[PDB]
Amino acid sequence: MDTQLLIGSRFEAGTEAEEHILNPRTGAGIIDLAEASHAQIDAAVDAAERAFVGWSQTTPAERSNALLKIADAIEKEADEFAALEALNCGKPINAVKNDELPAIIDCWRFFAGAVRNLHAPAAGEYLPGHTSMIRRDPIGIVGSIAPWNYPLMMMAWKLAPAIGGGNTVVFKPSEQTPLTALKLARLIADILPEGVVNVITGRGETVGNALINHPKVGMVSITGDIATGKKVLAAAAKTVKRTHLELGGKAPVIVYGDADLEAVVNGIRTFGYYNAGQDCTAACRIYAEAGIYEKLVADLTSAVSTIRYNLDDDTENEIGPLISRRQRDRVASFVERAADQKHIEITTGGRTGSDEGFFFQPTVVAGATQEDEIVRREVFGPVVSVTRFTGKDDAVAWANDSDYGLASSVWTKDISKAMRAASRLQYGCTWINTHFMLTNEMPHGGIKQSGYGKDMSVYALEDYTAVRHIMINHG
Amino acid sequence: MMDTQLLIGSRFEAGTEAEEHILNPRTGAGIIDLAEASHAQIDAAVDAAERAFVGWSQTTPAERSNALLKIADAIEKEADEFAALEALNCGKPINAVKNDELPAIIDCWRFFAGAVRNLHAPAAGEYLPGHTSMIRRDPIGIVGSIAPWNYPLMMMAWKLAPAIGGGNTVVFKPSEQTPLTALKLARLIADILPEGVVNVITGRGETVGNALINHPKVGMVSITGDIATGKKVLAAAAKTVKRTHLELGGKAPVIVYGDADLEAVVNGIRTFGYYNAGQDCTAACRIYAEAGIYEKLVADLTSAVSTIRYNLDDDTENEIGPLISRRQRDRVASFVERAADQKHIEITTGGRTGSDEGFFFQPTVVAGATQEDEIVRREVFGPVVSVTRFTGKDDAVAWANDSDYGLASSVWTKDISKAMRAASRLQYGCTWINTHFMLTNEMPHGGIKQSGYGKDMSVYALEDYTAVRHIMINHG
Amino acid sequence: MMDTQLLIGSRFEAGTEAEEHILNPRTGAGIIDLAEASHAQIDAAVDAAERAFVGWSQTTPAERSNALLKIADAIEKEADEFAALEALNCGKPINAVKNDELPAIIDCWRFFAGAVRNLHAPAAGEYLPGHTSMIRRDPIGIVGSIAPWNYPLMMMAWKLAPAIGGGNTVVFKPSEQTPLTALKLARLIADILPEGVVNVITGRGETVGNALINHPKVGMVSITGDIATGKKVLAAAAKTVKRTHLELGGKAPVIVYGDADLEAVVNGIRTFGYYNAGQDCTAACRIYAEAGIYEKLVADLTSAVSTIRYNLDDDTENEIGPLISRRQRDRVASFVERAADQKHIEITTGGRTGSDEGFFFQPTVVAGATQEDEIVRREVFGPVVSVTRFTGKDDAVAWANDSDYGLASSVWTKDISKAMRAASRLQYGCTWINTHFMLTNEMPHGGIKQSGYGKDMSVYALEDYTAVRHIMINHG
Amino acid sequence: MMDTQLLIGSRFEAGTEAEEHILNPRTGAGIIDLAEASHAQIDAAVDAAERAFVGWSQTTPAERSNALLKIADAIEKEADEFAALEALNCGKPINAVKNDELPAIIDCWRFFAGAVRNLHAPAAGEYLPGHTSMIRRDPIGIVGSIAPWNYPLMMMAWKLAPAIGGGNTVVFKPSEQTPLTALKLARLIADILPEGVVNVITGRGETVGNALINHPKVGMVSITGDIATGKKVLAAAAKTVKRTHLELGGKAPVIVYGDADLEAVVNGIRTFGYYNAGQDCTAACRIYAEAGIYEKLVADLTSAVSTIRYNLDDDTENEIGPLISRRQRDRVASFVERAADQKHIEITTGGRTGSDEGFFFQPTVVAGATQEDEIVRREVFGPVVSVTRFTGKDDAVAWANDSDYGLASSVWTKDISKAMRAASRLQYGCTWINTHFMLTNEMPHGGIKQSGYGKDMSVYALEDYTAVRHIMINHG
């Protein structure tokens, strides 16, 4: 098992308080990993600093080939990466083998292409006798923090564009899911020059905080919850660091009277619950039109109750557990408060789903209002709420009356309603007659309280570069 | 007699709070007293912005483009009067405003009208089988924008045109000392845009500015000012995850190699070190000069700087105006004094006040300055240029990059090789070769590090004000 | 009385050669006899374009942009008069020209004024170590430009603005039947652009057009016409390897599925199959109709198409005009007669000429035409629409794609799925869904296959008239 | 033995028709006799392409991109033997192929994998109220591609990658003398792509090329060759309005100013005037030298060019190889002999045949040549460079621009000012400064004027192989 922090030339174990990496299926310990010391953080940033000298001066072709190699490396060990990510997070193995790894590998490969393909306004004489041109240069040293929900994927989202942009990076995985990142570190170490990627581990309160507050770091990119985005943003206020923030969502799913209701029910069954709802695009806040509302609640209830989790044979599991006990408790807590509200019904699930480990019952919350906490607040759990709306009600406006703005979907056979919703929804993403489907060419990222900056697509790479104007006078 | 009222929705309204004394900074005389926005007027402006967003955000690129074309026309129709108003308010020499500023302002509005209809994105298509994807660029929401005082009207163009053109609505505040051209423009805009798309409030940063940037309904804040104010805006936005667009000043390095056309360098710095009395983010103010040429450069610049004319009765004959206020002069003076206190440093010309009335400081050259010197390390924002020597075992590029700032820069050399190497390595939003200062509305302006991020002018300013959206349609 | 003279550099001139009889197409009466440009005059136009290129190719995007804005402004000042002159010349109903064409023309000039300033390319930078590359889009040369008779003034815009905008100079020829607005515009342009940048000559394809296409100083030829002229231009270009820009006709397929809003479909075709008397490269003319609704659609279409007003004294009451010439009407009539010859084909309304005076044809519905029929295979360019049935066995899209044409199409259904799938697979420069005919200046119009290639409107038009260049500078 | 079979759809198939005598151009001895494709096999290859297009045009960028990456892997796995095969077939010095060509070929497949997923267009949105437009870049159809013999394997990469990348299907013909690497690569590709996406046929331009370019199903023709072949390809396409993609040679001007670095100029011209025996479309062949340095340059170049090594047994030691064929060697010799008969021209070195055996021509310097001379005006495509004196009353840029060709060019000067002015005014697809010849896969290659249009390498080649489509959806 790979246990060591990558710092410049060398691998070394932690020096600080150990963290208890648990297997969330059963609650048992996998390994104990010591956090990086402040000194260890300092040397990582330093190795990133001295590596930026050479790395920022590389050609796009040089950087692109590096990324292709990284992709080849992950591809070779795809099965091992999967199993190790299935252990760390208790994700069903086949969902990881089939869904995550190939997207991950495809991502490294997308960015190999994107690197050699940036555009800008054309070079020429905008002023007489002066030739202007636009470049995109590196920014500096990037401090990157990933969450626990898709460890290895998040790493790809954070590393590839920043490295591709000619930056150097100090990366910290979530305190509970450092495993795939340390295995990756090893392969990366063989491919990149020393210090272009450095990987430290530890708790956010201590290791995260020191990284985002380190004076040498010019950009900080985080994916997590709002609380932490605010901390990052407050820390940036000190030295005017660039920020890249993806802070979660509460994806509205507008279901009109004329939707293919069978496909809707199947869409929410998969995409409301995948990764036990620990996905920031989860199909979780549903708006059902008056006519189909009762039909939907029942049909979905029936569908959700059949979702398989925690079986002995992992190939038969559709859903894994929540990452930790604190996280399950947080989910249990949200639901309990909702079930307390007299106008709400819990039609299936609603309780803890596990003797050991951190499973929760796939849950359906019916009859929730725009005013309910369950509708206003990210639950990040296998939980879906349903809200009814009238013909007299603007379901798009209801959907836009939110703090979140990451992703959304609309279901209808109708063209007029599909297109009008798609033009008016205030969301980074809007799917029509599906949900959740990502592709590495297309940008992921929100507005409002979901934050700013993209992941995937050429825009991710534009976020990690600086536009520069060069103007030569013809004397 | 003059444009004095705030623009709040469909209401023109005098502020109801504390008055500001807007001074003719040539004479120190009071031009006018302007009551600032009350808290409730701040609220009404944001509320008009919110109401206007509904319609305005659903306009087409052609409608917004045509609106922007009209503002330019309106400005153009009143170029004489805008220029005369800004000259009075800021003390800028009238012909400088007429020939340099107004044509660039009008061009800006016109540029963005074109940019509005010309946004690109990855092509639409099936990236996943049976799913058509396409990318849009939609409005973000309500912008609070704050302008500084060095170019009141041009800053407004930069702040407004790309925000409006993105289909955003705006609450705009000019700086406390220079609200006049903004109030004037607000009158003309009211007759062109639907009400509530653009709203204009006046007041102090600590009061009106602070309420504007902390308003829950404001989704993005854009400011051009100093580093302290940026750190303020970032601290506010931390409370609600507001998007930010920050231009925080610079200390433009000017690398002069030995094989430089030394005359051209002198003439450049004479203009671009001192234009607008050095009250310009991109001022040619931190000169690095190779050992071979240092001494000659120091003397020729010294002599050239000393002939810069100002505070003449015939405004035609003035090349720069005064600093904006007493406090700014006093601050510039102190930088000069502290630097002159240094044994290795020589003030070769100027370095003293340039008028009894008003706020002129003398064009100053500070020679013998070292990389450790405050005068090299920190932004002066007055008519002051420092010269540092570099030797052959020194890396002028490294030296220039060793800075908290990253907005603009120039390199001077007859040698295409050294130029291109310099240009490629400089950690500066912009690098001129064998000139300085020259702007064109198609080209982005904006810095790195503590200079901030985001661009003004170019298509990029407009990309900073729109949200990228992925739409995916499942066929089957 | 009327603008009569050719623009040849700094000079307005009567044409030296034989005269065209410019006819009023709704009465058949003569409007004016106009002398063609002689060969020496074609030489002088092109020489003046060569001299103008020296300067013009070297102007800034901003300069060219300001110039296109001023032309937009000029056409706008005289909009009514342009409309009336176009109406008279072309038989178009006065209010269609006034409300549809003029605003679109003006906006085309304004659109390109922006596009001129917003070209992108790959970013500059070091793709090879020590080498700084950049991409420019430079002018191509002298453009020989030829317009068809369908929309004289709009085609001018589509041809002049991107070409001039790209920094090319131009020698433009309207169609022999419709030079009138082109010459009125020529005077206006002459007061804005440096002499020789735009040149306007008049005359026939086989004489003046030929002499222009073949001139060894012309580096690019842009034509909008029929497949026949396109082949002629292509062959002419072959001998000198000229760049070509060709829009050569379309036979727009209209797929109507069982779940279409038939009311909308019928009103769409009533308007778009017949606008400008069907003298439109994009006319809704080849309908494919699912068996379930085929019957109703034919009957409902017949009824609406029979109410179409034309040839009335109240020109505000007219919906469509006449064909351009007797030649064109007779060509249309021969198409309709041959279609009427087939046993399986039924003409439900119209089918004969529609005036005693002038060149009107009766709006025509042709029912039961199949895939191998001439009325489906070939462009009629008359107020004539065929309807063809497909069953569930049939792949309506495969049918549509089985064509030499590739310009425009539409698909009508309330089902999002079927609509997107059609849009993905249609082999046509443009596909409208649940509408037709709608153009917008930011969006490109242009065919594949035998409709030619290259674009009008959008930045792609402007890309067509520029040469991409790679500059690479060695640092070492 | 080797790979000799043609690739038609699923089947590998021997050529049935007249044999081509494939020679080793170093010795003039036969390598293999290869029978050409019959009319039937040509027809079968086009038909396979037609079938394969139904699926392949419907694939995602991701799957096409993956396919390109795999083709790259396969070439890389067999880098050395492709190197050996090309060195033998073409006479290229082994190390040059191994180190220059193979790297660039592999990189070329990998760059297009990228490009395939990174196409941009104008952003989707509502440009007309209530209508959502988006732009797609869709495949064109079946591509007929013809490569020359100067870089068999590289040309194939340029022809296939953007073609297949854009989702088109291909019938491809290598040059008659040089099919060996294409037939090898053909077997690797059949293991990677779906059946019929790529088809390889062999034979002469006059038979096989002619039939390929005339086939009614081929929608686009791409050729790199001489101007003569471009003209007739154009004539063919004229009949049927096929898209063309023409790269038709160069005569690259090399402007050497007085303040140039003459060691670097001489070293540049030594390599790039003569690399691949001057059989390169970008060869630095047409030199313009300023009066002040004209005599030193001629002398220094002459002596640099006389030390060029070729025709040695130790191939590692050879710097250039022979011409492809006896016809080519003789074509160059007559170019040189006709230059020699000019009394004003001086042949400073070579000018004669360069081997008993094989098709070597001696590296040649032609001094004293004029703007009026054949040797200046026409592409020689041999190891031959011409030098032409210019004065201060002469505009070297204007002189360079007075040519039928427009592919590539360089300028040599240490002066910033002269380089940028030359780069901005030169009428060439490409301008290097203080280097020549260097290519990079992100950066477009392709000419203007009689060099033809359309690009190789870069996202532009991929644009050339796709159709821009406007899709507009009505919300009503």
Side-chain angles (χ1 to χ4, degrees), chain B residues 213-226:
Chain B
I213 72 159
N214 282 287
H215 198 304
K217 300 181 172 194
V218 176
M220 169 166 186
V221 176
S222 174
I223 180 140
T224 301
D226 59 0

mmCIF file of all heavy atoms in Angstrom, chain B residues 213-226:
data_model
loop_
_atom_site.group_PDB
_atom_site.id
_atom_site.type_symbol
_atom_site.label_atom_id
_atom_site.label_comp_id
_atom_site.label_asym_id
_atom_site.label_seq_id
_atom_site.Cartn_x
_atom_site.Cartn_y
_atom_site.Cartn_z
ATOM 1 N N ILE B 213 -21.177 46.743 -1.858
ATOM 2 C CA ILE B 213 -20.464 45.497 -2.046
ATOM 3 C C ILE B 213 -20.875 44.380 -1.089
ATOM 4 O O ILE B 213 -20.567 43.209 -1.351
ATOM 5 C CB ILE B 213 -18.937 45.699 -1.996
ATOM 6 C CG1 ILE B 213 -18.458 45.990 -0.577
ATOM 7 C CG2 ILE B 213 -18.522 46.794 -2.972
ATOM 8 C CD1 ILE B 213 -16.984 45.708 -0.385
ATOM 9 N N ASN B 214 -21.552 44.737 0.009
ATOM 10 C CA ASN B 214 -22.027 43.753 0.983
ATOM 11 C C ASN B 214 -23.506 43.421 0.802
ATOM 12 O O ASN B 214 -24.088 42.697 1.614
ATOM 13 C CB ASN B 214 -21.799 44.250 2.415
ATOM 14 C CG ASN B 214 -20.364 44.099 2.866
ATOM 15 O OD1 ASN B 214 -19.900 42.991 3.136
ATOM 16 N ND2 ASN B 214 -19.650 45.216 2.955
ATOM 17 N N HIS B 215 -24.122 43.968 -0.242
ATOM 18 C CA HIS B 215 -25.553 43.742 -0.473
ATOM 19 C C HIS B 215 -25.830 42.330 -0.967
ATOM 20 O O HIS B 215 -25.271 41.896 -2.000
ATOM 21 C CB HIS B 215 -26.121 44.774 -1.433
ATOM 22 C CG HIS B 215 -27.626 44.886 -1.390
ATOM 23 N ND1 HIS B 215 -28.447 43.827 -1.599
ATOM 24 C CD2 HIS B 215 -28.454 45.990 -1.179
ATOM 25 C CE1 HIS B 215 -29.736 44.233 -1.500
ATOM 26 N NE2 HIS B 215 -29.737 45.556 -1.247
ATOM 27 N N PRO B 216 -26.679 41.586 -0.224
ATOM 28 C CA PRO B 216 -26.964 40.176 -0.508
ATOM 29 C C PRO B 216 -27.385 39.944 -1.964
ATOM 30 O O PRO B 216 -27.089 38.903 -2.532
ATOM 31 C CB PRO B 216 -28.145 39.857 0.423
ATOM 32 C CG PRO B 216 -28.008 40.822 1.560
ATOM 33 C CD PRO B 216 -27.351 42.062 1.007
ATOM 34 N N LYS B 217 -28.071 40.907 -2.563
ATOM 35 C CA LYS B 217 -28.614 40.716 -3.912
ATOM 36 C C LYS B 217 -27.590 40.982 -5.014
ATOM 37 O O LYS B 217 -27.853 40.691 -6.187
ATOM 38 C CB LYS B 217 -29.853 41.577 -4.117
ATOM 39 C CG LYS B 217 -30.990 41.269 -3.155
ATOM 40 C CD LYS B 217 -32.182 42.159 -3.471
ATOM 41 C CE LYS B 217 -33.428 41.771 -2.688
ATOM 42 N NZ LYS B 217 -34.586 42.467 -3.313
ATOM 43 N N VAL B 218 -26.429 41.528 -4.640
ATOM 44 C CA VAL B 218 -25.349 41.761 -5.599
ATOM 45 C C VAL B 218 -24.541 40.471 -5.808
ATOM 46 O O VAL B 218 -24.054 39.854 -4.847
ATOM 47 C CB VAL B 218 -24.496 42.979 -5.191
ATOM 48 C CG1 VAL B 218 -23.324 43.160 -6.118
ATOM 49 C CG2 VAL B 218 -25.361 44.241 -5.197
ATOM 50 N N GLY B 219 -24.422 40.059 -7.069
ATOM 51 C CA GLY B 219 -23.848 38.751 -7.407
ATOM 52 C C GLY B 219 -22.376 38.798 -7.779
ATOM 53 O O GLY B 219 -21.653 37.780 -7.721
ATOM 54 N N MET B 220 -21.935 39.979 -8.165
ATOM 55 C CA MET B 220 -20.563 40.199 -8.621
ATOM 56 C C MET B 220 -20.196 41.630 -8.317
ATOM 57 O O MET B 220 -21.021 42.573 -8.467
ATOM 58 C CB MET B 220 -20.478 39.931 -10.110
ATOM 59 C CG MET B 220 -19.158 40.393 -10.728
ATOM 60 S SD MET B 220 -19.042 39.566 -12.525
ATOM 61 C CE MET B 220 -17.223 40.132 -13.044
ATOM 62 N N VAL B 221 -18.964 41.803 -7.865
ATOM 63 C CA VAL B 221 -18.433 43.130 -7.595
ATOM 64 C C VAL B 221 -17.211 43.392 -8.444
ATOM 65 O O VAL B 221 -16.293 42.567 -8.481
ATOM 66 C CB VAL B 221 -18.079 43.295 -6.104
ATOM 67 C CG1 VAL B 221 -17.429 44.645 -5.867
ATOM 68 C CG2 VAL B 221 -19.342 43.177 -5.259
ATOM 69 N N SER B 222 -17.207 44.526 -9.133
ATOM 70 C CA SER B 222 -16.033 44.947 -9.884
ATOM 71 C C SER B 222 -15.514 46.299 -9.414
ATOM 72 O O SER B 222 -16.265 47.252 -9.306
ATOM 73 C CB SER B 222 -16.301 45.000 -11.380
ATOM 74 O OG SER B 222 -15.164 45.555 -12.044
ATOM 75 N N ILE B 223 -14.217 46.361 -9.130
ATOM 76 C CA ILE B 223 -13.585 47.576 -8.648
ATOM 77 C C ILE B 223 -12.217 47.775 -9.276
ATOM 78 O O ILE B 223 -11.439 46.832 -9.450
ATOM 79 C CB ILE B 223 -13.477 47.603 -7.101
ATOM 80 C CG1 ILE B 223 -12.810 48.885 -6.636
ATOM 81 C CG2 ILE B 223 -12.687 46.414 -6.556
ATOM 82 C CD1 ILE B 223 -13.431 49.489 -5.385
ATOM 83 N N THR B 224 -11.940 49.021 -9.629
ATOM 84 C CA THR B 224 -10.588 49.476 -9.899
ATOM 85 C C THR B 224 -10.255 50.489 -8.824
ATOM 86 O O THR B 224 -10.931 51.511 -8.683
ATOM 87 C CB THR B 224 -10.460 50.125 -11.282
ATOM 88 O OG1 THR B 224 -10.854 49.178 -12.258
ATOM 89 C CG2 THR B 224 -9.009 50.572 -11.569
ATOM 90 N N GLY B 225 -9.219 50.180 -8.063
ATOM 91 C CA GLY B 225 -8.667 51.065 -7.048
ATOM 92 C C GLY B 225 -7.339 50.495 -6.563
ATOM 93 O O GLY B 225 -6.613 49.848 -7.324
ATOM 94 N N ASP B 226 -7.022 50.732 -5.297
ATOM 95 C CA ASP B 226 -5.749 50.284 -4.735
ATOM 96 C C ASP B 226 -5.863 48.931 -4.051
ATOM 97 O O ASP B 226 -6.971 48.398 -3.870
ATOM 98 C CB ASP B 226 -5.166 51.345 -3.778
ATOM 99 C CG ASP B 226 -6.098 51.694 -2.606
ATOM 100 O OD1 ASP B 226 -7.216 51.155 -2.478
ATOM 101 O OD2 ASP B 226 -5.697 52.536 -1.784
#
